[PDB]
């Protein structure tokens, strides 16, 4: 259950009660589509249905022809597998492995073993189930349903080609054409991972797609194979807390804690994720990619309870930009009201239920439905949870404008204090 704590001292709110799902690795699987080497239907005729088949075959052939024309690094794992498949003889390993089965584990040249699955076999359908239907002597097809089912089978290839063409062979998220939900669910079950990870990934397949990649690998020897790069969640169920920060100004000099974003416990240390796009959030599970993470000591949590703790140097910025704004946190909203701008909190039925005075203040999502700051109307999150207000004297009142260095784009508590002490030393 989610719990929010607003700290009036630093105008920051921490939304605890979350559980982690941190992507610490990648799982690369090879998805193969066996392609027919057909060039055309041999006969020519005036049948309208066969012309539709030829039109669909032209779509098929053009799709194959289109495919043949094709900090960290997010696809380094799938690119590595793709480059191995380009080596001589590695395609025939996949061809022989999937000769009698649709799933196989293939040991490549590097020694890595990758699970290979054949999700579609157009070579079988076209050569064995489509071409024998065509009466070459009359160049006619008996039933129209053959045309319709050919369009359905070929449709997945056309959409896979369509996505690779516009994404230059690397698509993210992995769509349902690359890997259907049943295939993705079965693929997760087939991964050599613990049951806790399988339960986590199966319940959140929509998050798995958003964090996955599809890499077009080979189009050679009647095989269309692309590497799907699924995420591995090695860290699960560890506590997470999101730090929401809003400007804190005198009522002038402003102060804002810059270290906002998600924090999660990881192997005795705190993984900090500054970018907002990094972490996807579910009911109470936070899916943060560790590639965009900073590893911090566990003492980083002490900045919430004590901004002047000696165990850590909390990051803040200093400026004179006394502009009113509101941060719509979970279970509430931080409202910073300054100047002549009027800030109010409103309810759907009762209307304006609170008028914010000058300073930084917090309103829970209970009762409040919208927040108005200046000319901007903010809607608050209606998540169920318990919000806690921690009253305290704002830290911005301890400084003085004469020596406050109000130009730090990114600094820390100790850096500001040392720079202040330098100002006092000169003065």
């Amino acid at each position, epitope marked *: 259950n989610i719990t929010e704590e607003f700290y009036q001292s630093t105008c920051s709110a921490v939304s605890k009660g979350y559980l982690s799902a941190l992507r610490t690795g990648w799982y690369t699987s090879v998805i193969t589509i066996e392609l027919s080497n057909i060039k055309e239907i041999k006969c020519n005729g005036t049948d309208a249905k066969v012309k539709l088949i030829k039109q669909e075959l032209d779509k098929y052939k053009n799709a194959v022809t289109e495919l043949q024309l094709l900090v960290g690094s997010a696809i380094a794992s799938g690119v590595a597998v793709s480059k191995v498949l380009h080596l001589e003889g590695e395609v025939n390993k996949i061809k022989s492995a999937l000769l009698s*089965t649709n799933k*196989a584990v293939v040991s490549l040249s590097n020694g890595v073993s990758v*699970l290979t699955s054949k999700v579609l*076999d157009l070579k079988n*359908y076209i050569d064995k189930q489509l071409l024998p239907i065509v009466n070459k002597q009359s160049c006619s097809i008996p039933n129209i349903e053959t045309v319709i089912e050919f369009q359905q*089978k070929n449709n997945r290839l056309l959409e896979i080609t369509r996505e690779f063409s516009v994404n230059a062979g690397v698509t993210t998220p992995v769509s349902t054409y690359m890997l259907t939900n049943s295939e993705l669910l079965s693929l997760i*079950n087939d991964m*050599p991972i613990t049951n806790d990870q399988k339960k986590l990934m199966s319940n959140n397949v929509q998050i798995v797609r958003q964090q996955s990649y599809s890499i077009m690998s080979i189009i050679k020897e009647e095989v269309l194979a692309y590497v799907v790069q699924l995420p591995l969640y090695g860290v699960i169920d560890t506590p997470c807390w999101k730090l929401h920060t809003s400007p804190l100004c005198t009522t002038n000099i402003c102060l804002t804690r810059t270290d906002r974003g998600w924090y999660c416990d990881n192997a005795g240390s705190v993984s900090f994720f500054p970018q907002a796009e990094t972490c996807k959030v579910q009911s109470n599970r936070v899916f943060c990619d560790t590639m965009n993470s900073l590893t911090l000591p566990s003492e980083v949590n002490l900045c919430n309870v004590d901004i002047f703790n000696p165990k850590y140097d909390c990051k803040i910025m200093t400026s004179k930009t006394d502009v009113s704004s509101s941060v719509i946190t979970s279970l509430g909203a931080i409202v910073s009201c300054y100047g002549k701008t009027k800030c109010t909190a409103s309810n759907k039925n009762r209307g304006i239920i609170k008028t914010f005075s000058n300073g930084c203040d917090y309103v829970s999502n209970k009762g409040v439905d919208t927040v108005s700051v200046g000319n901007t109307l903010y809607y608050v999150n209606k998540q169920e949870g318990k919000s806690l207000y921690v009253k305290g004297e704002p830290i911005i009142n301890f400084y003085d404008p004469l020596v406050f260095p109000s130009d730090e784009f990114d600094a820390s508590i100790s850096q500001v204090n040392e720079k202040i002490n330098q100002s006092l030393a000169f003065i």
Partner: antibody, heavy 111, light 111 residues
Framework: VQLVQSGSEVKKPGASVKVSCKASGYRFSNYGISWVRQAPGQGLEWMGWISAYNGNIKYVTVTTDTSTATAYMEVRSLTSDDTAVYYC??????????????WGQGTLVTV | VVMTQSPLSLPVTLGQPASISCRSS???????????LNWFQQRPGQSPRRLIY???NRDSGVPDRFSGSGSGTTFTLKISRVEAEDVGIYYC?????????FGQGTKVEIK
């Protein structure tokens, strides 16, 4: 590529017998093992499948030892109806289609 | 998936052809257009060996006399010329569905 099983076993009802299956000629971890029962005068019957890649199990307790490339099947509460030949077949490593290309010579368990 | 197999006994004169049919209760066409139907042979005193691994694909080392045919729910195994080494029990198997199932088996003899 071959599979060799344990010798014939004679047991009394209510006991437990663990058949083994030693693999050679291929990478054990790239496949799974399917166990098939053949009662005398009766057709083949699929019992269970264990993957050497995932550890996944389908259906008696089947286990695989990757280090020794050996698969085990233990049948508990043996009855007179459990007198049959038990085969191990190399199978799909994941939830695909089963093929059972290579079979062990067969362990005759008598109860 | 019940794999009905017919006939159960197939006494065949040497050199004459033999046909074994095996009809499934459901269509064996998988999500991918393949139909994973296997044919096994159990030589007397030996473990079953795979002959045909998809409806018509002979396995490596299988003589050309063994031909597989069929589609959908009905399948056929044919031997062009029955020799002394063709005596055995033949099982059709499907691996497409969750649980592999075998046929009742066909006992081929010599008249």
């Amino acid at each position: 590529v071959q599979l060799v099983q344990s010798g014939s076993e004679v047991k009394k009802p209510g006991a437990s017998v663990k058949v083994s299956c030693k693999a050679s000629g291929y990478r054990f971890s790239n496949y799974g093992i399917s166990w098939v029962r053949q009662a005398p005068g009766q057709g083949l019957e699929w019992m269970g499948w264990i993957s050497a890649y995932n550890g996944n199990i389908k259906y008696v307790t089947v286990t695989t030892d990757t280090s020794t490339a050996t698969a085990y099947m233990e049948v508990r509460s043996l009855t007179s109806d459990d007198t049959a030949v038990y085969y191990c077949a190399r199978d799909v490593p994941a939830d695909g289609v089963h093929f059972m290309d290579v079979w062990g010579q067969g362990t005759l368990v008598t109860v | 998936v019940v794999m009905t197999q017919s006939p159960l006994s197939l006494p065949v004169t040497l050199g004459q052809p033999a046909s074994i049919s095996c009809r499934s209760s459901q269509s064996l066409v998988h999500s991918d257009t393949n139909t994973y139907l296997n044919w096994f042979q159990q030589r007397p005193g030996q473990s079953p060996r795979r002959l045909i691994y998809k409806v018509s694909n002979r396995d490596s080392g299988v003589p050309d006399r063994f031909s597989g045919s069929g589609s959908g729910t009905t399948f056929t195994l044919k031997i062009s010329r029955v020799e002394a080494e063709d005596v055995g029990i033949y099982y059709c198997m499907q691996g497409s569905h969750w649980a592999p199932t075998f046929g009742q088996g066909t006992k081929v003899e010599i008249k």
